[PDB]
Amino acid sequence: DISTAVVVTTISDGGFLDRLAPALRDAGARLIVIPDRNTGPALFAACERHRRLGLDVVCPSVAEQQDLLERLAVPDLIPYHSDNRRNVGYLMAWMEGFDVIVSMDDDNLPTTDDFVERHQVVCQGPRTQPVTASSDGWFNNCALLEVEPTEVFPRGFPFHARPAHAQARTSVCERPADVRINAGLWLGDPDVDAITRLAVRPNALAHSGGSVVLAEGTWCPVNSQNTAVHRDALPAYYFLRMGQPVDGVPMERFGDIFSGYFVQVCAQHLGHAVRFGDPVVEHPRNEHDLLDDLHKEVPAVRLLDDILDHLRDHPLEGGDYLETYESLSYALQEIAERVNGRAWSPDARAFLHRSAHLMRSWTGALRTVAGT
Amino acid sequence: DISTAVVVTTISDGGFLDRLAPALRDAGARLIVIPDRNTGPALFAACERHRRLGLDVVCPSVAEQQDLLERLAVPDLIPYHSDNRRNVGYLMAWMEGFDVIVSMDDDNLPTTDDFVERHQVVCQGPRTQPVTASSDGWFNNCALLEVEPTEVFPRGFPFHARPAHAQARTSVCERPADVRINAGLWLGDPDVDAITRLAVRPNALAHSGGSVVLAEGTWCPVNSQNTAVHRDALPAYYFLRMGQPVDGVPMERFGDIFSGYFVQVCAQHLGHAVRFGDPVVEHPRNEHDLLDDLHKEVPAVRLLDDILDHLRDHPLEGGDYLETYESLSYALQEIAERVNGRAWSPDARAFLHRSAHLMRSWTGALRTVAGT
Amino acid sequence: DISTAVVVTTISDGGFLDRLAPALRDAGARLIVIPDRNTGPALFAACERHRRLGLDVVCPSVAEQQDLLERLAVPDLIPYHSDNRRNVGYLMAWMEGFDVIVSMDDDNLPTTDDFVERHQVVCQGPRTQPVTASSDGWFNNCALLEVEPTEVFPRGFPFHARPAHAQARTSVCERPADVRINAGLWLGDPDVDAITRLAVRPNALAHSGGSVVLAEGTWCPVNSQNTAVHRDALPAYYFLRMGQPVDGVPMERFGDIFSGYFVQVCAQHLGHAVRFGDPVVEHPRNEHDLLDDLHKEVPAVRLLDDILDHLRDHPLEGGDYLETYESLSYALQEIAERVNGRAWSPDARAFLHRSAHLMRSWTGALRTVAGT
Amino acid sequence: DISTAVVVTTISDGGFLDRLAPALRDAGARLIVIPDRNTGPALFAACERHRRLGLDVVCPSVAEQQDLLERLAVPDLIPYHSDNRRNVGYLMAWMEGFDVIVSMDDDNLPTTDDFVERHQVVCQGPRTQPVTASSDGWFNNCALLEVEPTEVFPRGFPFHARPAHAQARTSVCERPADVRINAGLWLGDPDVDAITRLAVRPNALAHSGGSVVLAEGTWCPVNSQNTAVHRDALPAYYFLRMGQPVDGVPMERFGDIFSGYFVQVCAQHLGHAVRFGDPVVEHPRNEHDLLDDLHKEVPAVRLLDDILDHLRDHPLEGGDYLETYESLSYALQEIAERVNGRAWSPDARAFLHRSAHLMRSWTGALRTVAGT
Numbered sequence A, B, C, D: 001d002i003s004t005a006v007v008v009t010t011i012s013d014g015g016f017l018d019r020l021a022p023a024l025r026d027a028g029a030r031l032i033v034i035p036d037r038n039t040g041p042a043l044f045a046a047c048e049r050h051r052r053l054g055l056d057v058v059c060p061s062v063a064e065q066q067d068l069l070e071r072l073a074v075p076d077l078i079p080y081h082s083d084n085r086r087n088v089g090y091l092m093a094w095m096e097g098f099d100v101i102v103s104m105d106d107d108n109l110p111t112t113d114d115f116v117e118r119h120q121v122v123c124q125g126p127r128t129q130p131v132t133a134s135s136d137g138w139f140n141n142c143a144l145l146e147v148e149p150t151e152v153f154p155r156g157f158p159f160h161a162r163p164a165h166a167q168a169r170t171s172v173c174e175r176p177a178d179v180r181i182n183a184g185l186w187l188g189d190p191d192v193d194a195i196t197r198l199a200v201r202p203n204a205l206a207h208s209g210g211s212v213v214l215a216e217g218t219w220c221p222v223n224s225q226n227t228a229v230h231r232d233a234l235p236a237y238y239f240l241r242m243g244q245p246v247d248g249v250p251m252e253r254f255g256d257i258f259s260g261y262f263v264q265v266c267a268q269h270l271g272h273a274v275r276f277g278d279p280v281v282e283h284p285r286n287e288h289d290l291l292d293d294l295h296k297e298v299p300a301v302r303l304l305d306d307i308l309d310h311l312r313d314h315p316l317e318g319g320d321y322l323e324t325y326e327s328l329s330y331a332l333q334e335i336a337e338r339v340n341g342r343a344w345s346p347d348a349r350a351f352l353h354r355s356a357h358l359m360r361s362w363t364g365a366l367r368t369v370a371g372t
Ligand SMILES: Nc1nc2c(ncn2[C@@H]2O[C@H](COP(=O)(O)OP(=O)(O)O)[C@@H](O)[C@H]2O)c(=O)[nH]1
Pocket: A008, A009, A010, A011, A012, A034, A035, A036, A038, A080, A081, A082, A083, A084, A085, A086, A104, A105, A106, A107, A286
């Protein structure tokens, strides 16, 4: 028996419920919708309507949310007017003992009846399994899709590695593997960065390449759009706070890029694995303000390659995801001071130090919950 | 006979002279090299050598240049440590009565023996010829090239027109046209923005499209890397001063994007035309830090769409290029106050205002030369 | 005989109308209150209350305001949510033909029944009279007041001249002078800059020193809080738009520091003079977050010394204030390119260029009224 | 025997040693001079000559310093081109077991022959002695001086407490106290902030009030210009790294305002005390870019009142200065997320988190020297 919770944060009126509730309803999944201060009241009605239609959906008011965060002594941890409020659902689903947490946006739509069943691969045991390795340490999950205009990389894929990646050796081998994170893919508008979207407005047409499980030492970015996490890894799945300036420019839109690398680094350290493939969602093409998305994403892009290079070198400690995550936060602070380059001004260094304190303030709430 | 001056600014040894002298020397072309402060002394030795071998090359000392500018009462117009120093070559070539000024980068190699002769297309006069018009006002000169990975747009091409551009209709009709700007294309690393370079890393394989002369009302960005300008249009070809911050971030790398749009706009006002196609140069793909290029171009890219929209609507006065350019400078200043959007903070608005003054200080310089 | 209009912008209740109204009503002077988008509607009640009670007050809506700025072709010249909207009062007052425009803040209250009559000193015409000069080119109007902790300088006084000022020689000659600006002083909280207020929180106990008329070449900042301008000078009294960044930090609180210097430099070019002294208002200590005031003024303060220096060496052209003001606006554009210092980054020079355009937009609006 | 080491970091020619070497040579004090990347080669000359006349002065090369910082595992702790290098002097003098470290600026000259001896008050122990308490929590050490124009506060004195401070009641009571920090005063140009120096340019003519020892809960800023620290307190005296932006603006010139408060807060936690009074140095008026000093200090000034207020409500832990300092670093991180106010942009909050990490890097290096 696998208890599953889907976490969404929305400032919509609740319409996404209509087409999203079926696959969760028929599967008996709980749906946590996290409203914000800028969430109009229609959302709450839409929930009680769908609860009446058989879906186990809850939707805690901001006042409820803040009460919980206040009792766990993390009152300022999670801002309002942010999709950071994600973290509230992660915490609630974990508090309540769910095995599988599925992180979604309110615009992603499952495309198959077995959406929940497939994300439950993260509840498989360890298995001798085909594992996918790349000579250069990276795997491009968009390679599993038919993408119309031209080949593309996912958002958060490092840039320095892209030119040579196509010449890298990809190998499949049977090894023991214990999947704890399932990153399901997306059709229509795929999770590419604002650079790529602006340059080729790609269209993901089909899921053609199956699924994969990345060998130790092979990484690919994991987003929070269509992603199952096993309850043991949830401590390392903290969605990072955006807004910190790099060279004076505030970063946005990369909170789940850090999180999807962090949970992934921790998992490998603990002998666990990340899977990419089904189930796939439908991500509609939002067509809003691509130049603004670029302006938001550039500060993080200017830092990520260096942060990812330094994480490889850095050995971690811990015997579960909380301890390893805490050790990681200290490593980021050592990296914040060791890294070098034009993007690394005082505010850019300081962004790491603040993020590390917020990561331990998060685990600290998980301990308070657990009496640790 | 038609007299031509190639203008190149550089901070290098002069080794580029070796593969660039042949075409110039055999045509009797003048090569103006603008050295900078951060320019080693090898270059000056390199020129004297090639001069001895027959190439009519000149290499005015920083001290020479600065005396010209003082004597013209524009001592602060042209910054140091910047490829803005092209402008001295432009001025020197104008001052000495050259018919055709070709703007180049020190790293662009001619690929044919009649390089100079082809750029003299700007010296044929008006005639009825095949003219190319687009239903959306834009032409994509990169479509005249076979580009390796996927279709691309040139640097400076507005972003709001890209998605729909493939659906515009293109017509070729016999109209009178007076070509005064010839933007030759590039094999290798084509002139795309940082966004496009990062996303697809395009390779320009061949110039298979022939040449086009853009109808009135159809525009395409014009760069300063492989571009001939008839001396009457030179006064509107001032390479814009970069470094003005947009919302805090200093813009760079777009001096010729504004200059190419400004000389085009003035040309069409005066009933002249821009040609795209041959002669072709090879542009070697030496990238280094693409992410820094991106950080530099984004501030200009955030304003350019709006600047272009207001330029389509803004009627200009003037009978020659100098009159029309000054009228454009005042138009930019009206636009600075009418435009609206998230990117148009006070420092973005003031950018246009200081550019406008710089533009008229340049034309004041040319006026002084011509009044004496 | 002499028509007088007072000009005040306010986001208040209209409460100040209370006690400000007497001195103006008995003198039958027009009071023009310019409300803003962020102003209360209680204000308009106050207005027509007094209009019954005998005071010729007129406080027009944002819409009438915008109607006029539209009919004068300057619909973007005066922003909202900013005391810059004084300028609407200046223009209306000029338009209607008042002889004497008195600029006030809504927290300054006359202290004598002759308030309007003392400000009318500006319609005396040329008459031989005592005139004061300082060998260093500066006069400290605060030395006309008794100030509580120690000696102070008015806001806008150049910092480089402060240490030596006590050793400058002051001299008085009787000579012909035509007073067109009357800058009356302040008791209670004197108009000092944020630096001074923070350091010594001065209190101006009395007006001990009588009045002075400054000789040509002798300057002192003039504010818009208790300052009478003669109709002919009002063209040059345009209140400068704040908000431009200097090194990324936007300036504020100095719109009238520039206008007071600009009207003054124009006046002296035309052979007119500035007076300081009676009538005295009371300015209540409303010290509201002095550190914020400091953070706002510092950008402007880092430029002003250099601006005043270059203004001394820049001779102007014009036969009236409009012409001279426009000549000034162009001098500033030269100065913006000639000056040097660490504060003179690209956005700080662009401040001068956008301001010059805004000043010529203001004179263009008045030309429109007059038929140039 | 009481061993004393004076620490100075300089970029000067070494001329200051003429007027400093006597009072220290006479006392057999060691003088540690920390040069920087940008220190002339003359300064090394000066040191060698001054040792030839008996001054035990040492001037370690930047290569020498960097070897020690690498061996302590802190190669990146202390930047170059910064008076932060002070810290190297503290570390060297603490390593060598000096009882008393006297932190100086290279332009602070002793006015008495008992300079060293007087600073040795820090090495007498606890005893019952006159102890000064203030009803408001603050003591203005400049009140011990005769100041020429008017009353002033020292650099780093909170701004909210200044208006009401003259109304505070001060008492002197016999109480046990243990003086571990001695802040000697300054004649000539007192240690004022840029605000004050610009406003009134104070001249400190005499030391008239004797010396005081502050009761628990009464604070006053302590600078690093003329300040003796006992051995045990040096771990808490790390001179804080400047350069972090507050709302885009880099803070500077306040490294010792923080250190002076951090050491003071640790001292009182440990039941130790701060002294103000003799001995006195002459601080010659330097007069250099005061508007730049102001631009540099304002960002720190915008945060300091809030930090101090939060420090009063934050209980610490530790049984020595290392432990108490590390405890303080963690309290700053909590404060960084609790404080509220306009200046508290993300970069300003992250400023505290990066500082705390550098504080713990500094204590870590001290622990490595001690094997603890
Ligand atoms: N709590 C909260 N959620 C938000 C906010 N803004 C966006 N979201 C949620 O974020 C998710 C998708 O965000 P979006 O901005 O549409 O990014 P895009 O699809 O990658 O371009 C959806 O679940 C939205 O409801 C906000 O201010 N507060």
